[PDB]
């Protein structure tokens with residue numbers, strides 16, 4: 001698949017679980033894989049699987065974001081809807097402000113519709129509409145991939 005979509009985010013936001021829900025090729029996931037979702041044919045990257053080589057935590061999360069800004073056509077910025085906006089999320093956001101490329105914000109661990117309102121805190125990151133998802137329950141994936149593919 002021609003467009004490249006990269007998932008970026010701090011640890012424990014659900015990146016590998018979403019990669020495995022979406023990816024064709026079966027660390028916790030294959031890192032780089034073809035993917036197909038209906039009419040969408042693309043390559044997917046879980047940048048959280050890229051070992052940066054003995055660097056501090058914050059440097060590793062910023063460097064994963066930088067690799068996405070280099071490699072990808074569209075970035076999925078993933079955050080944890082049960083934890084709010086953390087400083088580490090703010091640090092990833094500050095890196096992603098440097099790109100012109102489309103960033104779609106995905107708020108994961110929203111395990112049923114009653115949790116949707118947890119998205120409103122994440123408008124503060126400055127990437128527009130947060131998309132609620134659950135990788136374990138398989139929720140919101142079509143809506144997320146439609147927003148990503150709008151950019152193709």
Ligand SMILES: Nc1nc2c(ncn2[C@@H]2O[C@H](COP(=O)(O)OP(=O)(O)O)[C@@H](O)[C@H]2O)c(=O)[nH]1
Nearest residue numbers: 011012013014015016017108109134135136137
């Ligand atoms: N409640 C909940 N837990 C999830 C969800 N997605 C992932 N998890 C769990 O959160 C943990 C971290 O998930 P993982 O995909 O490895 O996150 P990563 O560190 O961002 O790659 C694991 O225990 C997952 O099973 C979700 O949608 N809801």
Ligand SMILES: [K+]
Nearest residue numbers: 111112113114
């Ligand atoms: K529900």
Ligand SMILES: [K+]
Nearest residue numbers: 140141142143
């Ligand atoms: K769906």
Ligand SMILES: [K+]
Nearest residue numbers: 073150151152
């Ligand atoms: K384009």
Ligand SMILES: [Mg+2]
Nearest residue numbers: 015016028048
């Ligand atoms: Mg992972």
